[PDB]
């Protein structure tokens, strides 16, 4: 494994440190042992340890400014030495001094002429979930993350480039967005803006990420609220202060679906970051999406909903009024227990009341392909397999198979179970369907593994008990599978329970079913209690916040496929008004 | 829309401000730019901006006492200039100085001779839910709302009229009732009472609203407790202090149903304000309604309840003993599955045991019209459609239609479901029926939309599965609608479940019903969890408070329609005792 290789090399280093006396005296900061190894007896002052480190590299891991100076005064070429290992390919002696906030060592490494543009492209400096931190590649980025504002400026003094981007195309600003101490990263974010060129164009706040992300837009996708609140102060204008009233005018540029994507909205609903869902609830955005929904958002969702309501009640009207036949097969020639009345009409006659079905069968197929023409959570897979069964039934039609009902049946449940997708929004039943959305595709697929276990023990028992018994009277368990289906129903107490009192029940049924009734309830009562984990107070706020999440998500969906002769752009643009042509939304509020 | 017009005009103003250099220097407070535009080069000092504003109006929005003075020293006619726009029709320069608490500018606008009676009848000053604040029309009202007691008195010094009413007939006192800072509005409420005429008649606390509402009575309907507690100190008298005992004597005038309405009680239960329900729980009122119910309130509600109990068990006794006939229609001439035994007797014979039914049918119709004679929450619509079905059944009688049972049946459930209305009060089952009152008319009408969706997908499936099958044995789904009714019951597991083991179940029933059983439970279990939102601790207090709400509501109902030879007036009047003829209720309490 990889998690053990670094554990071993961290120990193989200590071996070579313990083995190499130069690296040892540099670790133990033994001043009276380096000169015994560098001046009297000239040892290998360029000693590469296990991790390709030098004596100065070891003298920097542990703040040994003495051992560092001894190695820089007896061999001033060790400062320019980078780590020559795989785990630290790029790290130098200045990196460790800036990380350790060794100001007097950064001040001394810079007085020695260290490089302020050395990238630390080692594998331990990467952005991985198994790595604990991530500060970047450039030493200025490290000073920016540790908070040592004295070192941040001290690196700029010696020619540090803020425009310098790492391998991920991240400036020093983007790195400050992925840090915990947001309340102190703001003061460091502003300190890094004061060294800009001072021009309104090619600004550092406008240098986008390699994934097309400005430092302002990244704070929204990552869930960073404090930096999103701090970055908003740079892009908002206040109009007037009328006592408690303050009508502020927000910029609303990258926070708008203007670019095809190139929108903060289209990035909050699409990310899997749970913290990001709190960003559309911020005061510059919440006034947008609340006005994007109170008008022209809610009625259009009711238009597509009502259309799909009628498109589904039409498909059902074509199934209750479909071809008929009093069964052309002779009789019950196979098995006598045959309730078969095949209803297949290959012909296109019946024109009186079938010409109404002719156009009806034509609408459901042109709508099914229209459903697929606009496609080339869980409610997304229900609508696509619905129209898939429509074309397969059209294939079972014109071929008229005896299984002409199995493909036609799946389209009934999927047509309506996808019309409860419109409960998302509309009224307050939205969080109810987002609650079952976590249930159908969360616990159910895991809870059934425990119920099938209980059924496959009792169903296989009730079959052997009534295998000796005659299935004519009390034949709940007769087939191999139907013995399980009756046990499945009996696990839900839908059936009366195999209660035949005229016959003599076998001695093992009156014993096994009692054991099934208790355990079936103890798995039902323990399932009801298992749902109480989402009841304290935040979970009512989480799903209501997640309902508003999928509410704003659907709101942005309709803005892209609908035309533009309706549904205007958010706010008011900057033309015919002394503005910068960018949008703006006038939101006045009141304090206390 | 209207919410965008103000957004545009707020930007069209900034254009004309940016365009007009006079309005611009007045905004930027550029003293060295107004004299360049008023004295050297005489610009249009009366420059009407986009919002009909003057340079002084702009010099007042932002506290620019310099720019204001420059415009009032070079053109002293701008003080009398009101806003000539539609959004601010009436606002002047003094309005903005009082709102901004610009004491030295109010002191200067008043030294310039500004008007202290200018109404600000603009559309943005109206009492609307989309407007953020509401302070009134008169400048004294604005000083009263902002709290600047130095400006409140400074306006009275220059002839401010407290008796001045706005368009809504509201004095300065009524405006202080609709403010958040109640704990500081009290000190401002008292400051505005000290400038009254000093006479006990035509007092400002007695100037009613245009809707017949004194400032004391408004605090109760609005839910304002702190001003209701503060206004009570002016109308209560203490009798004696016996150590911890303090027998206080409350006024009880407008807090009584003396006037036809002209009562604080009749206004708390009728308003939709949830905060107002906390007012009948106040210590001057709670002692009233608790004594209005412990005697003569509870027994009379038991009288009308017992009367309606017997009036309903009588209507049911007339249906179980109604006309009879062994069915005059030939046989089962239509369809053989006909269980019909029509019971229609158009004749008025049968006098032995029917003369008991004759008067019985006469009581239910004279009571049904009596129910309507006293009419010319949800429990209000149950009693009226009940008596409506009584008259329609009387119309189906004397005409003897074959649907003589459909109108007679609706009156059975409505007669009893309206006798559980008497659970409101009586004992502690009141909050149980006010809980189902929010359920029958709250979530049910919304939750059924999601269950019909699930049923209309599976019911329409189980019909096509058993359309090929013979409905003789396992005919749960045979008709177009009955296939849905059986699925509806199966959604509630009332039915055994289509469990026929003698026949061979179709391959698609043994698959679709399993999918129905799980999803039917996952919509049932997710409905049970959805009821937990009313369980933390305040919701048990909210419905118990709402139960007491509908308890006090019913208490005031009986006081109006009942006669006066019983049920005396609250408290003891002020005659034969040295009192003011107004109630009073002697309520002694104990401190600690
Ligand atoms: N192009 C398919 C339309 O998208 B939809 C959609 C619309 C109607 C029926 C089913 C799916 C969608 C929207 C938000 C989420 Br989350 C998931 C699906
Ligand atoms: N005039 C009808 C009598 O009023 B009632 C009423 C009395 C008996 C049966 C049904 C209604 C009423 C009282 C309070 C509320 Br809240 C709603 C209805």
From Swiss-Prot, chains A, B:
* Gene Ontology biological process: calcium ion homeostasis; calcium ion import; calcium ion import across plasma membrane; calcium ion transmembrane transport; calcium ion transport; parathyroid hormone secretion; protein homotetramerization; response to calcium ion
* UniProt-recorded name of the protein: Transient receptor potential cation channel subfamily V member 6
Summarize the protein's role: Calcium selective cation channel that mediates Ca(2+) uptake in various tissues, including the intestine. Important for normal Ca(2+) ion homeostasis in the body, including bone and skin. The channel is activated by low internal calcium level, probably including intracellular calcium store depletion, and the current exhibits an inward rectification. Inactivation includes both a rapid Ca(2+)-dependent and a slower Ca(2+)-calmodulin-dependent mechanism; the latter may be regulated by phosphorylation. In vitro, is slowly inhibited by Mg(2+) in a voltage-independent manner.
Q: Name one GO molecular function term.
A: calcium-activated cation channel activity
Q: How does it sit in the membrane?
A: Multi-pass membrane protein
Q: Organism, per UniProt?
A: Rattus norvegicus (Rat)
Compartment(s) where it occurs, according to its Swiss-Prot or TrEMBL record? Cell membrane
Ranges for the region named Interaction with S100A10 are: 552-556
Q: How is it modified after translation?
A: Glycosylated.
Q: Assembly and interactions?
A: Homotetramer. Probably also forms heterotetramers with TRPV5. Interacts with TRPV5. Interacts with S100A10 and probably with the ANAX2-S100A10 heterotetramer. The interaction with S100A10 is required for the trafficking to the plasma membrane. Interacts with calmodulin. Interacts with BSPRY. Interacts with TCAF1 and TCAF2.
Q: Which residues are exposed on the Cytoplasmic face of the membrane?
A: 1-299, 424-443
Task: List every position bearing Phosphotyrosine.
Answer: 134-135
Q: In which tissues is it expressed?
A: Expressed in duodenum, proximal jejunum, cecum, and colon.
Describe where the ANK repeats fall, as residue ranges on this chain. Answer: 17-47, 51-80, 89-118, 135-164, 168-209, 211-240
- Family label: Belongs to the transient receptor (TC 1.A.4) family. TrpV subfamily. TRPV6 sub-subfamily.
